[PDB]
Assembly symmetry: C2
Amino acid sequence: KQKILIVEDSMTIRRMLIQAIAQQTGLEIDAFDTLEGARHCQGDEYVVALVDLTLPDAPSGEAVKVLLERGLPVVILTADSEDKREAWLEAGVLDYVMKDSRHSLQYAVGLVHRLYLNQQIEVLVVDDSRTSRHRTMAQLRKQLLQVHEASHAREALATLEQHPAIRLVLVDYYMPEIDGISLVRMLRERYSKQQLAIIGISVSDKRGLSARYLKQGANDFLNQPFEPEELQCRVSHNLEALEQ
Amino acid sequence: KQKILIVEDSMTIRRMLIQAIAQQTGLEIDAFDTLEGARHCQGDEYVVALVDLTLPDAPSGEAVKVLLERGLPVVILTADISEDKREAWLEAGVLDYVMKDSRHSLQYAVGLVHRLYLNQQIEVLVVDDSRTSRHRTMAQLRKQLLQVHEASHAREALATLEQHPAIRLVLVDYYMPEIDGISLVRMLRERYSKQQLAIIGISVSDKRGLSARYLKQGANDFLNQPFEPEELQCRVSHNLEALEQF
Ligand SMILES: [Mg+2]
Ligand SMILES: [Mg+2]
Ligand SMILES: [Mg+2]
Ligand SMILES: [Mg+2]
């Protein structure tokens, strides 16, 4: 999919977003001031929809559910707490962008650019805890990535053999048989930081596990527990490095 | 300075380091197999020295202190590591260490020396209302060879930025009196884009979701407290590289 949908009645905000996404990404953008204007907009043609909660024909966020049910991923554009972040995210919204300033709005621009590029990117999560593994996988799937799953380094190695397009691996630190630092060592014996990006999952409650990952050639670290925003920052930056 | 010193008696390891650093950086290299070979070497000519602990004329790490005392910053080359060694080396004033147990671990030294060279001409700002954590972070950044400015509150940070427009990276403490970190980030981003001024938002991570708030407000990155020096170094290097390359 190559297009972005914007549903936002503010002329100023809609124009800011169109200009910025056009300049920075070159992606095709369809923008409407009402939910009704977007009635022909389908999941199969759009990467994501940036959706205002205050629409003239949907003034209390009704456009979110409508577009999600048509198969369009949704990012909410919002002016204003822990209860909203939760409720909308539980409803399956990918993310929210604050629209109280031009610079907060700019978050959406990098976001849609990343979502578009992620569609064709394969990543791998290696983690022996089903609970941590599935949480991370769900979060990466809301970044529109193709996500492979491994419960064990042995599985991860086999998955990499089978799927050479995988370009980023997230590696848990303690696992049966072959721990994370050992897996990083194995991978770096074969693959450079440009051929295969590795983010070591660590804890800052420790004798420098992050340092050990980096000294073995991991591109970066991410400390557990992490929030989706943190995961997105760290994954995006590493994917962007591979593209440059 | 644009030269590095390597003192390493392993023919294999020394040659791997020379080849990689020569191919992947702009640094001139002087490399010797004994501490004596480096007798002429002066702190003012070299960015950093990569120093083996097992040298023929310094078989138990003696070259570290000798070279530090000559004013050369020192990164240790080590085949193994423990928590006691890391602590001892950092107390002694070593910048960092490089594992030399494989070819791919040596690669760490290459990215490091390239970064240490570039950092000499880069100005950064630490904003933190506690002198203790502020000075610790400043000391860690000064061991990355950065030019480090300090500010004890948002008001001073702004004044400093006005007075020093070359500052390209700001590290921001959230909890400060009068104007908190996120408020400072909002002010900065009303004037400066992510490419004009990188910001790493520092937070304790709890129910307030501070990292996310920083990110949504335009910070380039986050770093949660407590953090280790290597974590700080990694984040700073990544943000500096993004400014140069993205
Ligand atoms: Mg509206
Ligand atoms: Mg585990
Ligand atoms: Mg030796
Ligand atoms: Mg404070």
